Swiss-Prot record, chain A:
Protein family: Belongs to the flagella basal body rod proteins family.
Localization (cell): Bacterial flagellum basal body
Residue numbers of the full-length protein present here: 2 to 67 of 134
Source organism, top-level taxon: Bacteria
Subunit structure: The basal body constitutes a major portion of the flagellar organelle and consists of four rings (L,P,S, and M) mounted on a central rod. The rod consists of about 26 subunits of FlgG in the distal portion, and FlgB, FlgC and FlgF are thought to build up the proximal portion of the rod with about 6 subunits each.
Natural source organism: Salmonella typhimurium (strain LT2 / SGSC1412 / ATCC 700720)
TM helices/strands, residue ranges: none
Protein name from the UniProt record: Flagellar basal-body rod protein FlgC
Curated annotation (Swiss-Prot), chain B:
Quaternary data: The basal body constitutes a major portion of the flagellar organelle and consists of four rings (L,P,S, and M) mounted on a central rod. The rod consists of about 26 subunits of FlgG in the distal portion, and FlgB, FlgC and FlgF are thought to build up the proximal portion of the rod with about 6 subunits each.
Protein name: Flagellar basal-body rod protein FlgG
Organism placement in taxonomy: Bacteria, Pseudomonadati, Pseudomonadota, Gammaproteobacteria, Enterobacterales
Naturally occurring in which organism (per UniProt): Salmonella typhimurium (strain LT2 / SGSC1412 / ATCC 700720)
Similarity comment: Belongs to the flagella basal body rod proteins family.
Gene symbol of the encoding locus: flgG
Places the protein is found: Bacterial flagellum basal body
Length: 63, 46
């Protein structure tokens, strides 16, 4: 449509922002302990996937 | 169930309060003079 380029780029930007936020949160919680209800803190990562509408944007299903 | 109390309490620092003198009994040394006196126990001259 010559306009899905904006959608693809926006999805890429959102995914990169999510990944950066996760990394920053892990760095902040590097030396934390005993979070809520006492369970130890565990690090998290994100998984990128493509939206097969072929060629499509990137999404993050879950952390 | 059992977690840490999760409370914050910041200190401020340390200050000197007093200097106490150990009013114990010192040894006696002989000066052989005839006008020198030494206290055995408690008491101060005036």
């Amino acid at each position: 449509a010559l306009l899905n380029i904006f959608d693809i780029a926006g999805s890429a930007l959102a995914a990169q922002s999510k990944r950066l936020n996760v990394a920053a949160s892990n760095l902040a919680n590097a030396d934390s302990v005993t979070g809520p209800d006492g369970q130890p803190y565990r690090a998290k990562q994100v998984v990128f996937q493509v939206d097969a509408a072929a060629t499509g944007g990137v999404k993050v299903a879950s952390v | 169930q059992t977690t840490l109390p999760s409370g914050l309490q910041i200190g401020t620092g340390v200050r000197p309060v007093a200097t106490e003198r150990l009013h114990s009994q010192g040894n006696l040394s002989q000066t052989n003079n005839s006008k020198d006196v030494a206290i055995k126990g408690q008491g101060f001259f005036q």
